[PDB]
Design a protein around this nucleic acid. Structure first.
Lengths: 79, 94, 96, 454, 105, 88, 96, 92, 104
DNA sequence: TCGAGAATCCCGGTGCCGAGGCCGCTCAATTGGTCGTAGACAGCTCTAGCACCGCTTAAACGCACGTACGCGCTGTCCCCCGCGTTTTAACCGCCAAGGGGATTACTCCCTAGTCTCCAGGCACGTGTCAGATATATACATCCGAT
DNA sequence: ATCGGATGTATATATCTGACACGTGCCTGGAGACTAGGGAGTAATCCCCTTGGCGGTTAAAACGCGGGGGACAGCGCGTACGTGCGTTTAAGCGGTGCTAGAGCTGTCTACGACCAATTGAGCGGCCTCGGCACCGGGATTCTCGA
């Protein structure tokens, strides 16, 4: 379907920024299983704000308002 | 003197409606005193940060129905919405 | 027939990907990952194109925040390789 | 009945023959009257004639509980064994693995008459002593029960008896509440007259001789207090003088600069008006040196020690043995480094001195031609009852905070067999907290001397 | 006829609608708004005391003492995420021996 | 030599070696090493430096000199370690 | 001369200290640990005696919350013993 | 239309630096930083004034709520930067 | 005679006194409470810029771009504890390689 | 692979003090009735979002290899457990002080309401130069080699 | 230790483009002058903690210990990830239509705020009597051994 979105090298160039040296092979089924989780505790709190404000357009302030709640405050978009 | 106004009876009325031959110890009264506040002062300070986004003032029964689906993680949000709204349509129609 | 040893180009990506702040994961497939997952929550949604970036600037600061704390459990086991034995320890202490 | 019954041999003394027929009057009508006397007059022998006298005469021979302190618990099992061997005694001691043999096989089988106990054994046998109709329960040295918010006031009222007896040596504080609080335990028909004659006691009576000295004819069957100088008519000395002195610049400036710091350093009287007033540098903030090498100008600083800086060149040659009571054993570590450093042969006791370490020093302190003259006491453990009769000069330091204590701590001088002259000093400075305290000790003593007067 | 028994609740409503206005949570509080709050207050206190009624019969006692609540919350999965960083006084802990500290057989 | 309280012990050693075993036995560990009993006595003193400092600051704020349990719980609430069982 | 093997009484404390909820660390020395540390912040303080317990009920729920997450890094190194190599990893991911 | 702080921070830069310009998106961070510090002090100031059953935010209910949030040797600084302003806003 | 300039400051006090009344923080705010908050916010906002400003020339540029604010909060012993939850758009991390991954 | 032997469970007793009922109470919820207005629903504009389609080349995939690390197995020391042994330090009780924390209850003063200006801040018009591509310049750097 | 690449930094015209700036209304702050509600500031009365001494008990803590099971370097070893090269292949941007909906404009009620009477639901006390804590005692079983 669409979990082919973030690829194998697109996890490798993340893990280089994380400062690891040799990536195993079993990670590429775990990382997609932990990136699909983090888009179900932000988007689920971005749909809830946008449905509440009676809009059908998820805006850049909802996601910063959702990420404000669970201690991952994101600067650079508004507040 | 010093009424101080806990929830010492209302919790105990709920205990006589789900296990009507039990009792609750007075130490565990003070815990369930401070578990309904931690839902009260977490929803009420959530609708205060949600009416302030859209710039309204009226905390309605929709700035609470949105502020329950954020806190209650899963299978408590799918009941306390349908349990709360049960105690609103039964409110205004009498 | 020149070739570096294994253990070399893995360093010349670290000291290059810790300087440039380009967006790592690909911006068009990450767009249509977000649009799929929201459709389990409400159908017929439109995103601002400066709001789908707000997930891409924040999910990367969660995975890099995971892989900079995964490796401290890998090096703790006295090997230099991450495994899902390490990810499932890293998410255990913070956010299971 | 002015002889002793033939189970009590050995000719009980004439001041206690008059202590039994007068004690028959307390048996009759039920009043559990207090029996107080001076230390040494054999109040034991007036109680064994109360738990064996019932056998042949009154015919009871039942359970009796006697609560005595543990420091005198060694005495009582001997005294029944001396006089009346027929009786049952049952003393209590041990850990878990060695006590319950005296609770499985001795008490519950009713195989006892006199259950001599300790005060801590009451609170850990408060089930196993409830199982008996006690007959005559006697508590000796009866001043623990002055506090009614205790857990002996509110324990020993639980299990009951027909009548009783109490023995102390003291009528208590002249704030008057500790008299009635024992009387609320003597008879439970007294608290209905305690705060109902409440106008009849509270007023500071100018007519003492026409109320208070005529209040006694109601209260004379409740109490007794006697004096050893009417049983020997020879115990001559009773002497008590004191000085009025002043501190110096390390605790005179700091006497009147720590009130700038305060008006830690809380509870100003204990923290900053006994420490910085009696004996100096108790904070290690009035030090010359981190080498702290002991020297003069570290005993010259005190107002009090500067008497002792001149006393122990006078006091050594007069020939005495100097018993120094004090408070606060932290301070005795200063006084012990006054005689180690300056060559005075010394001994000591405190509340940390374990009980065989105590008497092992006292026996060498009572060698007839010995060496160590100076014995460091403390006023709170210096009221137990212990043999120190070979000295003749006592220098208290501070104020007698509860004013019977250093008047009980003089019983380390005039115990039985002291024909020496006895001098007892005291130290009180000028303008300090302590004159008001010794005013408070003046008022708490000119009204129970009254009771000895009246 | 009260308000706190007009919608069939068992929590109070007039006490809560006092505290949504002196607690300075907004300027205007809707009339039908604290009545919707005083059911979600009670459904979250008729869920813990339901599971505390399966600790007293699981340890053969009658009262609820705070060891029961600690066994009530932690064996649940849905009240555990709500109370993730939440302690309970003298609660102890859930019994859990990790599966490698066993003996050899 | 005898005048001083000096040569005695501290109060950070007030929690001892078995009281860090029986904590860790509750934690479900099998064999503690011998090195831990200084590491844990450090990290307990740091955590009480980040609660009492947020407790006296409330107590100076009402100009009381009585650190009540209301002040201690309100300190623990902000840093995500909410304690129940003391009112509020 | 009976004696259990090493590895036995260490289990019969775990299944006993995970049932009784008595206060583990000693209540009088923990009182005078709190009274010392506050004196670096403000002198002359008095505590409520039901407030010094509020530290004892909360510090134990931090150390037990540390030792139930220390051991997951000890077992991850395939030994069954904690070390300060593990505590300094456990505090790294949450709260350095 | 909106309102923001993109004119004041540009002045506070031009005290401490005469020449270093500041870009667009890096003003957006400093825009959304002193909206974070404002909504972390006051929300701690309000709940502090409500613990004591009073009704008034003052400079005694901010100064306490700045000693909590500021970690260490910043509250030692920032108290000395606030009370320098009260003794001018009152004394003039 | 304006209100911020009488307080000797740079941040506005005519705006903070409106953002305390209308945010439902409390009913009554003090007279000086938006001066002492317009100063505590001054110092912290000056602190990030100046500590971005010394490192505004490690790359020898003269525009602060969001890499430099990231190297001004994460390169400080005390401001990092105030913001150890936050992120920044396009901030990155510090260059570090651990002590076993190196060539030896 | 099953008997000695302690630990743990499970019965029975006692008895004690907390939890629940019940009374008197008083004061915060509850009605009814005013009166202002924020939000609700209708109504218009324009803006930003979706879906296309075509072109160009970074960037991903699947291909070899080949060495380098992860795991398994070993003896090899050595570091913490399990149990009997001294003394100690918590834990009660007690003592004798006095003072710092909480309703009444009074009467200043500092914050908000209202009306009327006005200068400061704010988007939108031109309209400039500081980064960043670039492309050719020399210039500092770890492995096949000895 | 030395010579062939493969990595990196000093540099110049040479451009695009965004940050710093100038010219306009309008919107909010602030001066003003009353007016009241919050809280300062004393002033009685009562209840909990702190200072440094005494008494005793009594399970834990502290100190030895031999011993045994784990930690920890070695060393073999073998798949498994890294590196690099021809091949596909989807991102990217670049227009270009086409219209959904975000944000607003403009009425006008439906609905909270608030008032003084109203008058029960909920509040601290008091007495009590089952639940559970405890102490014997004997069954049940869990791990050491042959």
């Amino acid at each position: 379907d669409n979990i082919q979105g973030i690829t194998k090298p697109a996890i490798r160039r993340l893990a280089r920024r994380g400062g690891v040296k040799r990536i195993s092979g079993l990670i590429y089924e775990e990382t997609r299983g932990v990136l699909k989780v983090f888009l179900e505790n932000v988007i689920r709190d971005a749909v809830t704000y946008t449905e509440h404000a009676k809009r059908k357009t998820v805006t850049a302030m909802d996601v910063v308002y959702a990420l404000k709640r669970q201690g991952r405050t994101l600067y650079g978009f508004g507040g | 003197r010093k009424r101080k106004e806990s929830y010492a009876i209302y919790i105990y009325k709920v205990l006589k409606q789900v296990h009507p031959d039990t009792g609750i110890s007075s130490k565990a009264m003070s815990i369930m005193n401070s578990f309904v506040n931690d839902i009260f002062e977490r929803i009420a300070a959530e609708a205060s940060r949600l009416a302030h986004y859209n710039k309204r003032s009226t905390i309605t029964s929709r700035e609470i129905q949105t502020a329950v689906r954020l806190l209650l993680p899963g299978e408590l949000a799918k009941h306390a919405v349908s349990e709360g709204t049960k105690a609103v349509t039964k409110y205004t129609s009498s | 027939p020149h070739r570096y040893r294994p253990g070399t180009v893995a360093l010349r990506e670290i000291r290059r990907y810790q300087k440039s702040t380009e967006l790592l994961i690909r911006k068009l497939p990450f767009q249509r990952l977000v649009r799929e997952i929201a459709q389990d929550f409400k159908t017929d949604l439109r995103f601002q194109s400066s709001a789908v970036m707000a997930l891409q600037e924040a999910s990367e600061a969660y995975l890099v925040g995971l892989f900079e704390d995964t490796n401290l459990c890998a090096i703790h086991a006295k090997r230099v390789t991450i495994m899902p034995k390490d990810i499932q320890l890293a998410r255990r202490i913070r956010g299971e | 009945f002015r002889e002793s019954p033939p189970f009590i041999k050995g000719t009980m003394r004439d001041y206690q023959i008059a202590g039994l027929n007068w004690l028959i009057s307390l048996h009759e009508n039920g009043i559990s009257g207090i029996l107080a006397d001076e230390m040494g007059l054999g109040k034991t022998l007036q109680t064994i004639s109360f738990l064996g006298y019932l056998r042949h005469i009154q015919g009871i021979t039942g359970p009796h509980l006697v609560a005595v302190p543990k420091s005198t618990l060694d005495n009582w099992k001997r005294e029944f064994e001396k006089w009346t061997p027929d009786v049952n005694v049952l003393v209590l001691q041990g850990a878990k693995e060695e006590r319950h043999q005296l609770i499985n096989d001795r008490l519950i089988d009713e195989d006892f008459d006199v259950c001599i106990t300790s005060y801590e054994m009451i609170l850990r046998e408060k089930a196993h002593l409830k199982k008996f109709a006690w007959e005559y329960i006697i508590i000796d040295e009866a001043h623990r029960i002055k506090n009614e918010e205790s857990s002996l006031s509110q324990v020993i009222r639980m299990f009951s008896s027909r009548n009783r007896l109490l023995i102390t040596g003291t009528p208590l504080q002249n704030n008057l509440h500790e008299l009635w609080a024992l009387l609320n335990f003597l008879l439970p028909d007294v608290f209905g007259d305690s705060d109902a004659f409440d106008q009849w006691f509270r007023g500071q009576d100018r007519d003492q001789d026409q109320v208070v000295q005529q209040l006694h004819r109601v209260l004379r069957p409740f109490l007794l207090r006697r004096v050893k100088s009417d049983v020997e008519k020879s115990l001559l000395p009773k002497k008590e003088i004191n000085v009025y002195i002043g501190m110096s610049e390390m605790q005179v400036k700091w006497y009147k600069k720590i009130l700038e710091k305060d008006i830690t350093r809380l509870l100003n009287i204990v923290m900053q008006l006994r420490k910085c007033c009696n004996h100096p540098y108790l904070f290690e903030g009035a030090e010359p040196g981190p080498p702290y090498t002991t020297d003069e100008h570290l005993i010259y600083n005190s107002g009090k020690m500067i008497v002792l800086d001149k006393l122990l060149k006078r006091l050594q040659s007069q020939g005495s043995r100097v018993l120094i009571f004090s408070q606060m054993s932290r301070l005795l570590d200063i006084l012990e480094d006054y005689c180690v450093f300056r060559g005075y042969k010394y001994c000591r006791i405190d509340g940390g001195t374990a009980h065989e370490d105590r008497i092992a020093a006292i026996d060498e302190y009572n060698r007839p031609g010995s060496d160590k003259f100076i014995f460091l006491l403390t006023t709170r453990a210096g009221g137990l009852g212990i043999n120190l009769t070979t000295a003749d000069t006592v220098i208290l330091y501070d104020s007698d905070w509860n004013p019977q204590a250093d008047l009980q701590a003089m019983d380390r001088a005039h115990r039985i067999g002291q024909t020496k002259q006895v001098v007892v000093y005291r130290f009180v400075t000028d303008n300090a907290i302590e004159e008001k305290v010794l005013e408070r000790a003046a008022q708490k003593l000119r009204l129970d001397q009254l009771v000895i007067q009246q | 006829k009260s308000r706190s028994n007009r919608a069939g609740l068992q929590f109070p409503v007039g006490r809560i609608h006092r505290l949504l206005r002196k607690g300075n949570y907004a300027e205007r509080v809707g009339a039908g708004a604290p009545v919707y709050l005083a059911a979600v207050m009670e459904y979250l206190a008729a869920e813990v005391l339901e599971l505390a009624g399966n600790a007293a019969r699981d340890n053969k006692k009658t009262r609820i003492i705070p060891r029961h609540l600690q066994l009530a919350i932690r064996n649940d999965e849905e009240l555990n995420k709500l109370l993730s960083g939440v302690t309970i006084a003298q609660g102890g802990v859930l019994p859990n021996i990790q599966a490698v500290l066993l003996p050899k057989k």
